[PDB]
Design a binder for this molecule. Sequence first.
Ligand SMILES: Cc1ncc(COP(=O)(O)O)c(C=O)c1O
Ligand SMILES: Cc1ncc(COP(=O)(O)O)c(C=O)c1O
Ligand SMILES: [Cl-]
Ligand SMILES: [Cl-]
Ligand SMILES: [Cl-]
Ligand SMILES: [Cl-]
Lengths: 274, 274, 274, 274
Amino acid sequence: HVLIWWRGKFRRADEISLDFSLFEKSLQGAVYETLRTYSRAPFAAYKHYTRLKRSADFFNLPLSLSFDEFTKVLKAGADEFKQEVRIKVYLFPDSGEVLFVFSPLNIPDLETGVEVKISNVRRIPDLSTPPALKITGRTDIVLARREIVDCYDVILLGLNGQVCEGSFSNVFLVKEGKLITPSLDSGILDGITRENVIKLAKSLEIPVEERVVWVWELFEADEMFLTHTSAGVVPVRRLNEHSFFEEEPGPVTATLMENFEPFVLNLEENWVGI
Amino acid sequence: HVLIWWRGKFRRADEISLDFSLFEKSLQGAVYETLRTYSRAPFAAYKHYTRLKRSADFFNLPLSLSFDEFTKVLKAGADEFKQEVRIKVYLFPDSGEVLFVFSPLNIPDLETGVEVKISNVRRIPDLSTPPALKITGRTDIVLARREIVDCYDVILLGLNGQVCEGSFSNVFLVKEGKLITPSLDSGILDGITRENVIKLAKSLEIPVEERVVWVWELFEADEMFLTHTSAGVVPVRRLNEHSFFEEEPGPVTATLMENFEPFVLNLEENWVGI
Amino acid sequence: HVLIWWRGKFRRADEISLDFSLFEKSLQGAVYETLRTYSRAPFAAYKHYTRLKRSADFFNLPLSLSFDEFTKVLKAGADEFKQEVRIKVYLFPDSGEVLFVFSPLNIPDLETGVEVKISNVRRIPDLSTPPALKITGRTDIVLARREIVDCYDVILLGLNGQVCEGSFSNVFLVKEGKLITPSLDSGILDGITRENVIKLAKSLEIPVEERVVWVWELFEADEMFLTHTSAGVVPVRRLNEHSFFEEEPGPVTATLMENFEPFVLNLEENWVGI
Amino acid sequence: HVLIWWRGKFRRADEISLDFSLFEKSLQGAVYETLRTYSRAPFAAYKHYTRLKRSADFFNLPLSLSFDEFTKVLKAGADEFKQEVRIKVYLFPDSGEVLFVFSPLNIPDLETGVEVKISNVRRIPDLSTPPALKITGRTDIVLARREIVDCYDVILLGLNGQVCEGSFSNVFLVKEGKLITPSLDSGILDGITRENVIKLAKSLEIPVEERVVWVWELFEADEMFLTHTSAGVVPVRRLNEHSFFEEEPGPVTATLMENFEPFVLNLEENWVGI
Ligand SMILES: Cc1ncc(COP(=O)(O)O)c(C=O)c1O
Ligand SMILES: Cc1ncc(COP(=O)(O)O)c(C=O)c1O
Ligand SMILES: [Cl-]
Ligand SMILES: [Cl-]
Ligand SMILES: [Cl-]
Ligand SMILES: [Cl-]
């Protein structure tokens, strides 16, 4: 049950009709964002809109849609499901055409923790590409996602062995009661889930450090977890062959994931304009 | 007047209907190769086929068309024009689908030379993406293309300041009668025209060095030129604000240009199977 | 005519008697500073003392000498010459022993400009060694100085091709009337002559930019010059095979070098405690 | 009780008088090699001579002593002790002067294993200094030595996070019965003990891989050990906070240790010319 909004109308996601020149050009990549709903309301819509604009600015391609129109399509689309939706928004090169894809959000039970592995792909450094450019063809993320076989996500290190992030998530570790996450200067995407978790940690009086984190610190951590739009906080039970836990996520991870949804649902900055 | 070949037949390049999920996946990029025709015969076809296979093998992707079938599509499409054509070939990871785009080759007289600039985008390091991978979404090329404002092409350096390539071309310099070009070890996208010019130079007993070339050597060169499929040898009259000439290129470039077409068009290795 | 201060007494520089264990240990390097005199008064004595302390702190080896004692030895030593002196100060590992070497400053006529060349040695990056550690055995500076054969100094680029500095000087360029010099974040030593020249440029209403400077900008510059303790402002007439001028240094360089000595002789921060 | 050989004769290592300018130049560093004796006979003398020549050749420095003269000084000095000795050999660039330092080898029982830590100093890149250059002032080793506080040695990684070496040792890991060690291509100072252990492993049919080793593999290893001249094979019981064992090393390390002395002492290549 997949719905799309394309060229002014909602539509079935069986076939797509587009100008051939747009298709050939889209092979160079589309700028994009992913959203989910809570109670069928689009989450962090304004935050995602401004990130989209920022990705679009790395090309002086202005955004065609207003925030007001963006929210209108998001809400009309989500309203056609009796269930939470995942929403992908693509902005196309030169044309400025926008495509929304709505599909049911089927989020699994991750209380037992996931497996992650160190990627063979290093994150592209700033001198080659801005880390915050969310574009569909960027080869670090394209090549790294193809490595996800017997794990949930792969961890991209930067060129010097600093922890950057997962192929579709941000990384946090816990050590001696402190919540530690790579700084934006490590060369990472400023995830919206990450941002919310940092604020939640502070509201719970958990100490937080945003800094350069070296790969070997993950192997000495008391806890590790991932953050991304669809799932929120995702506990990591094993990195490569290194287990953090057997059954229960660690205590800092557990408090953050139980408090995540109530905290973000009542933080106004995640609901502006909706 | 664009013609395409897609899913078993030739079509007008006006609009295209695609399986929607194919379209979505195509946004991650296609493996690509470009050819042109001389006398409406596709040039260096076998060489271009084997190079395409090389990038396809990186993704464990078999070519759905044999060399023989490949040449049949190329000849068939080129025969529909009353003029020389540019042909772009796209190969899609996992699906193995092939897309050909034929268009009129409009080739200007560039004897007078072009302007080029040093790009602000460094070639993606080998730890992040193979330098020789011809995938349409690679962000070094994509972002470097957007800097082409008052110039012909821009020059991408590697992280260390060595010369790699232009955004659509290979780079050659001449210093004290030697033809010098970045080695494959410099981490480059190597085009067939580059190899052809190297062989031409050797046949004329012009010394050739394929080595690491530092950016500042471009600024001290006696002559500089670009190579690419559609235009062959393109003299550079100016790099940033640094002039090489005002009217006509130097002796080594001029000799290479005047001998290029006679030499490459009479070499059997460029016509195998056509 | 070379004088030394060693183990509490002034001495002839023919022989030196030291504990063998100190000699073996000194093969690992001594922290050091170089000074010159104006009117036989030690220049920027306090500035050099604090840099020495900072180099010493990269080892938690505290400085044995007080500033007051430092100035006392500097002045007593300089007072024994009827001529300006060059002064080298070495601080030795673990022991904290200090050695001063006084020799006549024989400064040549550099009004005609000097030749410099790009070094084959890249400046050691911060992850390997702090750029501000002035130690006698650091291999970037040791290896680069051995390259000075038919030039005055060699220019060390950083790992990415940014201009860092000369083997014993800092680098400035002039472009469209702006004075431009590598920022400290480029990974360089904060030279005391450099600092004074930046202040002098500002006092003369010359615009100054401290930023990342890429190697190719030197080849497009209107003017280039070096700064170091012994000589002050040193005009560069040629970089590699690229001439900036034939006879006369450019106008910005010329104003700075004529105004340098009067400016620094009347700036109190260069004379504190003397 | 230190004995030295300097300028044609053996001397007490109490005080030393030097030509002052020699001393000043010695502060830039010496090429070095270390040996020990078994039964008061200098071990792997020819191997150590040829390695010294290799670093000396980098500076176009001929060895002032022939192999035969070298062995005479080594035997003569070792014969003055009633005990095994450590011998350090220093060679000075340009002058070609040689300094030998003989001292009692006091060798502890390290069967129980040592503690090591990951250093905060990255191995100097190849663009700045050759990785295999054994010069006493190299700042990666000098600064890494100062971190040895509550541990035996620290581990230097390269800029990319690969394992290179300890500050005075080579690094080996064991994983699934394979002995793994950084390749020469990783950019390392290769010691003679490393080569001897590799040959020992092969003679015992233990599989050996010389390859690029990433830091995190140390944290997942079954066993880890160091090699260096004075101690041979040194088991690592703990890396940072990560324990490998509490009482005795694993089977591969234990076998290598128990077979080391019998094997290396009965190999003619380690005794040529003695
Ligand atoms: C590389 C990368 N890192 C992190 C994220 C997570 O960011 P957010 O929390 O906004 O979903 C994403 C988005 O999925 C991403 O693609
Ligand atoms: C590498 C390096 N850069 C720059 C300088 C110049 O600094 P200052 O102006 O304090 O002499 C020096 C000192 O000679 C140096 O060794
Ligand atoms: Cl142009
Ligand atoms: Cl750049
Ligand atoms: Cl220990
Ligand atoms: Cl580090």
